Structures are given as structure tokens and as C-alpha cells.
Amino acid sequence: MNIFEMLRIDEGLRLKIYKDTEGYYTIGIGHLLTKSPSLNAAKSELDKAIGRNTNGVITKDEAEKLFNQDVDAAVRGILRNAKLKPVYDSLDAVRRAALINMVFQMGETGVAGFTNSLRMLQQKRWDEAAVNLAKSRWYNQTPNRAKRVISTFRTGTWDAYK
Ligand SMILES: [Cl-]
Ligand SMILES: [Cl-]
Numbered sequence: 001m002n003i004f005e006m007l008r009i010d011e012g013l014r015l016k017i018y019k020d021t022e023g024y025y026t027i028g029i030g031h032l033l034t035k036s037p038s039l040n041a042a043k044s045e046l047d048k049a050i051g052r053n054t055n056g057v058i059t060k061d062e063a064e065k066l067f068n069q070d071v072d073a074a075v076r077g078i079l080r081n082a083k084l085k086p087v088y089d090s091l092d093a094v095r096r097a098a099l100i101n102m103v104f105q106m107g108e109t110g111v112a113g114f115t116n117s118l119r120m121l122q123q124k125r126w127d128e129a130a131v132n133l134a135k136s137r138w139y140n141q142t143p144n145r146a147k148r149v150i151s152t153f154r155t156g157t158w159d160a161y162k
Contacts, residue, residue, distance in 0.1 A: 001158040003071060003097045007104060009161060010145050013063060017042055017056040021142055027056075028063035030104065031070060074103045083112040090122050098152040105145075106138065121153065130154040 011030030020026045025033045025042035033045045047054050050062055078084040078099065088099055103111050120129035130150045139146040151160040
């Protein structure tokens with residue numbers, strides 16, 4: 001398993017504009033288009049991202065292309081972030097993927113916000129970090145996904161995804 005396969009499981013794939021768990025317009029593999037309520041505004045962001053008149057539909061390759069860009073951006077964003085980078089550097093390969101997943105979902109700022117959990121992770125106090133990560137809006141809103149990521153930080157294996 002790897003980051004791409006993990007995220008593809010968490011996000012799924014939809015080739016037509018849809019609303020995310022928060023009611024925001026998205027497409028592909030979790031690619032947010034806009035937080036605006038307007039479907040036009042979403043179509044417009046979509047065509048600009050794809051570079052063609054899409055009419056709200058994209059092909060699989062186009063979705064995969066946004067996905068690759070988005071996983072890259074998340075990695076680079078973690079590495080540029082003063083609060084995230086040291087955590088990322090202290091982790092093993094599996095757990096690094098869990099951190100990337102969270103940033104992909106909630107953005108670098110949102111994640112940087114979990115100050116207490118970040119320190120626990122950096123200290124390698126797995127069980128404690130898992131308990132702390134669970135006291136969050138994140139966990140209460142998308143519990144099954146949150147559980148899978150949490151379990152990954154707890155175990156350092158991909159079992160939650162098996
Ligand atoms: Cl984009
Ligand atoms: Cl969920």
C-alpha cells in the first residue's frame with residue numbers, strides 16, 4: 001500500500017462535480033473546487049484547473065492528474081511548514097503517509113493546529129497521540145476515516161486499510 005492507494009480508498013473517485021462531506025463542490029479524488037455555494041463558480045474553477053471547457057465532467061486521467069498534483073502539493077506543503085516538517089522528519093514511512101492524508105484532507109493549517117497531538121507523535125507516544133487525535137471535530141465528523149488514519153499512527157502498519 002502507499003499514499004496514493006490509501007488516499008484513493010479514503011476519497012473514492014467521482015468524475016462529475018459532487019458535494020463533499022461538508023457540502024463543498026469537489027471532483028475526482030477529493031479535489032476541492034470551491035467553498036462557494038454556486039455550481040457555476042465550481043464549474044468555472046473546474047475548467048480553469050483542467051484547462052478546457054468541461055461542463056462539470058472530467059475523464060479518469062484528468063482526475064488522476066489533479067490527484068498527483070494534490071499529493072505533491074501536500075508533501076511540499078508539509079516540508080515547508082515550520083510546525084509540520086519536524087514531525088514528518090521524525091516519523092517512519094507508514095506514519096508519514098498518515099500525516100500526508102490528514103494534510104490532504106484538512107490542509108496544512110488545520111493540521112498544524114493539532115499542537116498537542118503533533119508533539120505526542122514526535123515523542124513516539126502512539127497510544128496517547130491516538131487518544132488525543134480523537135478529541136477533534138475531525139473525528140466526530142468523519143469517524144470511519146479518522147479511525148483508519150488514527151489506527152495507522154497507532155500501529156505504524158497498513159492494517160486499517162486491509
Ligand atoms: Cl488546481
Ligand atoms: Cl468517515
